[PDB]
Structure 1
Amino acid sequence: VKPDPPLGLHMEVTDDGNLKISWDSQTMAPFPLQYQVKYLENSTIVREAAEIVSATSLLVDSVLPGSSYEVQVRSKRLDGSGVWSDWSSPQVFTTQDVVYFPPKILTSVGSNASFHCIYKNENQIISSKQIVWWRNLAEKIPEIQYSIVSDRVSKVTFSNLKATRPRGKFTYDAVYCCNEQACHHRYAELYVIDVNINISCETDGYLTKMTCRWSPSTIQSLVGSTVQLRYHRRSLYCPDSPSIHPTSEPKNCVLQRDGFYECVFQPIFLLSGYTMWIRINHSLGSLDSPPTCVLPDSVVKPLPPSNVKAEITVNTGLLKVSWEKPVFPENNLQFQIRYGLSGKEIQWKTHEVFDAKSKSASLLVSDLCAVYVVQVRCRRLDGLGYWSNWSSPAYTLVM
C-alpha cells in the first residue's frame, strides 16, 4: 500500500511557548503509521530539519520570534516494507516579535498568576535585567514582583489577585512587557472572574422534581464565551468534601424573568447524590465553580398539615386545635401553631409542639366568645429541611 499524505496539518503555540505541529491520522488505516516531518525555520538563520515520529504530533522547542516555519509531513506503515506517502502541501506559520508564556491566563479571584515574556529588539533578545512590566499602560508593577527566570526570560508574579475592574467594554487587564522606557504594541490579556457563584436547589413537595436556581450576575458581562451547568450523580449519598468528578454531564438551565436561571431535574433519584457546578466555557479554556453536593432528601419542602380544625371546648373554654400530619415526610415532625383574634389585624401568638405523635393541642384563650383564626406549619423534628407553608385558616364557632 501507498498511504495518502497526512492532512489537516496545524501548528499552535503551547502555553510553554513551544511549536506543536499536529495532523489528522488517517481514520481508515487498519495499521499504525509512522510520520516524517520536514520543516524549515527561516529565521535570522535558515534551519532545515527532518524528524521521524510515531505520534501524530511533534513538539519543537522554543518558538523563535520573527521566524517563519514551513512544514511538510509524510507517512509510512510502521511495521513492514512500508512505502512513504508523498509529502503534504507546505504550510507556513509566521511568529511574532514579542512572545508571551503563556499569551493569556484565565483565573479566578484570590489566585496567584504569573506571566513570562521574551522581547525581541532588532533581532536580538535583550537581557532580563532590562525587561520591565507594565499594567494597562497605566502603572509600573513594583520590581519586587519581577523575577529573572534566565538571562533572557522575564517573569511577573501577581498574588491574591483582585477582581478586574471593567473599563468600558474591556473586562481584562492588558499586561505589557516592555524594553525599558519604550513599550511595544503587543500585550497579554488577563481575565480575573468572581467564580464564587451560589447554586440553590429545592425539591418539590411531591418528590418528583428538583428545581435549582443560580444568578449569572458575575458573567452577564463576558460575551463570546458560553456558560452552562455541569453535574455528576453518585449512586448513594454525598462525599464529606465535594470534588469535581472527571465524568460529568451538562444540564440545560433556563433563565427566568428575575434574571436567575432555573434548571429542573426530573426524574429524581431520592437517595442519590446530585453534585452540580457552573462550567465557564471560554475561548481560552474552562473555569469551574466550587462544587456543591446536595441530597434531595435534605432539601424537601413538605406540604402543610391538612384537615386543621379549631373548636372551643364546652364548659372548659380551651381552644382545642386538631390537625392531620402531612403525607410526607414519614420522619418525626415538629409543628408550629399561630392563633389570633379574628379581626382586620390579627396579633398572632405561636405555640410549638415538638412531639410527632401530637395531633392536637389545647390553648388558653382570653375571649371565649370571639372567633379565633389558626394556622399550622410543620418541619422535620431534626431540623433537616424547610418549614412547611401555613395551613388554610381554621375558624372557631362562637358558642
Structure 2
Amino acid sequence: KPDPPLGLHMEVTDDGNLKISWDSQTMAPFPLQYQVKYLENSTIVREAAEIVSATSLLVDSVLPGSSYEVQVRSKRLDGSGVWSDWSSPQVFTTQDVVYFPPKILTSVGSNASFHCIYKNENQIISSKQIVWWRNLAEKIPEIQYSIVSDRVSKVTFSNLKATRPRGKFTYDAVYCCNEQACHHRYAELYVIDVNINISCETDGYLTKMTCRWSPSTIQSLVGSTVQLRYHRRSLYCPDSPSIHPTSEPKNCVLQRDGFYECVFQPIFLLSGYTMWIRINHSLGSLDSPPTCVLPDSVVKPLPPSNVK
C-alpha cells in the first residue's frame, strides 16, 4: 500500500494555466500513478478527478477570482495495489484580471504581444471594449489591438523601443481597461539595450587576453545576475557568430572606470573563441548578439625597440 502523495503545490503557468505538483515516493521501488481530485469554487463550482502517471497536472484557462481545492492519492502501477488515502487538501486562489504573459523581458525592436482577460463585476466584457493602456498616460492605438476571442483581448508591439526609465522603474506598466474603467493590476515590460561591444585585447607576450565591456545599460535591473558566457571550437570563427549550445561562464571583475574586465590565461592561440553576455533574471535569460574572435588577430604590437 503506497503512501499518500505529499508536497501538494499549485502554481500558475505563463499561459495562465494551473499546474499542480506533488512529491512522489522516492522510497517506493515501484511506479506510482496518482489520482488528483480537484474542485473549483468559481462563479461555477465544479469537481473533477483525473489519473496521471507523472507528478504534475495541467488545467487550461483558469478562471479569475476562483478557489481551487486539491487532493491527491497514490497507487502502485503494476499489480493489484491499493489506492492510498487522499493527500491533505491544498487551496489556491486567483485574482481579478488575467494576463498573457504576466511579464516580458526582451530587447529593442522585437515583436512582443500580450493578451488580457478583464473581469468586471463577474462579467467577462467583450474584447471589443477592452482598451490597452501604457502606464496610465497614453492609450494604445486600436490598430495594434486584436481579438483572440470575444472575451480574450490582444495587443502587439512591433519595433520595440528601449524602455526609457521613468523614476526608479525599468518596466512599462500595461493595463487592460473596461473602457474608461481601469483596474489596479498591470503587466511589466522590460526592453534593454542588449547590444554590447566586447573589447578584447592581447598582451604583448601572447599569454593572456584582457576583455572589457561597459554594462552602462544594465545598471537599472536589480535581482538579475550578469555574467559572460563563451564557447571555443577547434579553429577559427564561422562567418555567422552563433552559440554551440554547450557554453561555460567566465568570471570577470569590475574596474574603477565602471567596466567589467577579465583575463584568459593561458590561451589557445589558433582557436576560435565565441563569447557573449548572459543576463539571468527571474523572468528568464537574455543574451547579447554573439561575437567571435581569433586571439592572434587582436594583438596590440609592442613598441619598436633599440632605436638610435
- Which TM-score bucket, shorter chain as reference? over 0.9
- Following superposition, the deviation at residue 55 of structure 1 comes to 2.0
CA distance in 2, matches of 1:26, 1:246: 34
- Following superposition, the deviation at residue 30 of structure 1 comes to 3.6
CA distance in 2, matches of 1:73, 1:253: 48
Q: 1:208 to 1:26 in 2, by over 3 A?
A: farther
- Following superposition, the deviation at residue 216 of structure 1 comes to 0.9
Q: 1:175 to 1:81 in 2, by over 3 A?
A: same
Give the TM-score of the pair, scaled to structure 2. Answer: 0.95
3-state DSSP of counterpart to 2:143: helix
Gaps of 5+ in 2: none
CA distance in 2, matches of 1:216, 1:51: 50
Verify the 8 A CA contact 1:271 1:295 in the aligned structure 2. yes
- Following superposition, the deviation at residue 166 of structure 1 comes to 0.9
Q: 1:120 to 1:298 in 2, by over 3 A?
A: same
CA distance in 2, matches of 1:29, 1:236: 50
Q: 1:43 to 1:234 in 2, by over 3 A?
A: same
- Of 180-189 and 233-242, more deviation after overlay is shown by 233-242
- Following superposition, the deviation at residue 4 of structure 1 comes to 3.0
Q: 1:28 to 1:270 in 2, by over 3 A?
A: farther
Q: 1:204 to 1:21 in 2, by over 3 A?
A: same
Aligned residue number for residue 379 of structure 1: none
CA distance in 1, matches of 2:171, 2:4: 42
- Of 264-273 and 277-286, more deviation after overlay is shown by 264-273
Q: 1:300 to 1:86 in 2, by over 3 A?
A: farther
Q: 1:208 to 1:125 in 2, by over 3 A?
A: same
CA distance in 2, matches of 1:86, 1:235: 58
Q: 1:262 to 1:97 in 2, by over 3 A?
A: same
CA distance in 1, matches of 2:235, 2:57: 45
Aligned residue number for residue 180 of structure 2: 181
Verify the 8 A CA contact 1:18 1:59 in the aligned structure 2. yes
| Partner deviation per Cα, 1:5-52 (whole Å, 9 max, x = no partner) | 333332222222111122233444443322211111111122111111
Q: 1:218 to 1:67 in 2, by over 3 A?
A: same
Q: 1:24 to 1:236 in 2, by over 3 A?
A: farther
- Following superposition, the deviation at residue 83 of structure 1 comes to 3.1
Q: 1:78 to 1:109 in 2, by over 3 A?
A: same
Q: 1:49 to 1:259 in 2, by over 3 A?
A: same
| Partner deviation per Cα, 1:73-126 (whole Å, 9 max, x = no partner) | 222232223333332222111111100011111111111111100011111211
CA distance in 1, matches of 2:243, 2:84: 44
CA distance in 1, matches of 2:102, 2:172: 13
3-state DSSP of counterpart to 2:306: strand
- Of 240-249 and 89-98, more deviation after overlay is shown by 240-249
- Of 237-246 and 143-152, more deviation after overlay is shown by 237-246
Q: 1:256 to 1:125 in 2, by over 3 A?
A: same
Gaps of 5+ in 1: 310-399
Which structure carries more relative contact order (alpha carbon 8 Å, separation 6+)? 2
Q: 1:281 to 1:149 in 2, by over 3 A?
A: same
Verify the 8 A CA contact 1:66 1:95 in the aligned structure 2. yes
Q: 1:207 to 1:84 in 2, by over 3 A?
A: farther
3-state DSSP of counterpart to 2:85: coil
CA distance in 2, matches of 1:269, 1:150: 57
CA distance in 2, matches of 1:5, 1:286: 37
CA distance in 2, matches of 1:31, 1:235: 46
3-state DSSP of counterpart to 2:307: strand
- Following superposition, the deviation at residue 240 of structure 1 comes to 1.8
CA distance in 2, matches of 1:294, 1:250: 17
- Following superposition, the deviation at residue 301 of structure 1 comes to 2.7
| Identity value in percent | 100
- Of 151-160 and 267-276, more deviation after overlay is shown by 267-276
- Of 296-305 and 134-143, more deviation after overlay is shown by 296-305
| Partner deviation per Cα, 1:114-168 (whole Å, 9 max, x = no partner) | 1100011111211111111111111111111111111110001111111111111
3-state DSSP of counterpart to 1:216: coil
Q: 1:172 to 1:26 in 2, by over 3 A?
A: same
Verify the 8 A CA contact 1:14 1:102 in the aligned structure 2. no
| Partner deviation per Cα, 1:325-375 (whole Å, 9 max, x = no partner) | xxxxxxxxxxxxxxxxxxxxxxxxxxxxxxxxxxxxxxxxxxxxxxxxxxx
Aligned residue number for residue 78 of structure 2: 79
CA distance in 1, matches of 2:224, 2:117: 29
3-state DSSP of counterpart to 1:306: coil
CA distance in 1, matches of 2:297, 2:157: 41
CA distance in 2, matches of 1:248, 1:112: 27
Q: 1:6 to 1:306 in 2, by over 3 A?
A: farther
| Partner deviation per Cα, 1:225-254 (whole Å, 9 max, x = no partner) | 221111122233222211133221111110
CA distance in 1, matches of 2:234, 2:26: 37
| Partner deviation per Cα, 1:271-294 (whole Å, 9 max, x = no partner) | 222211111111111111111111
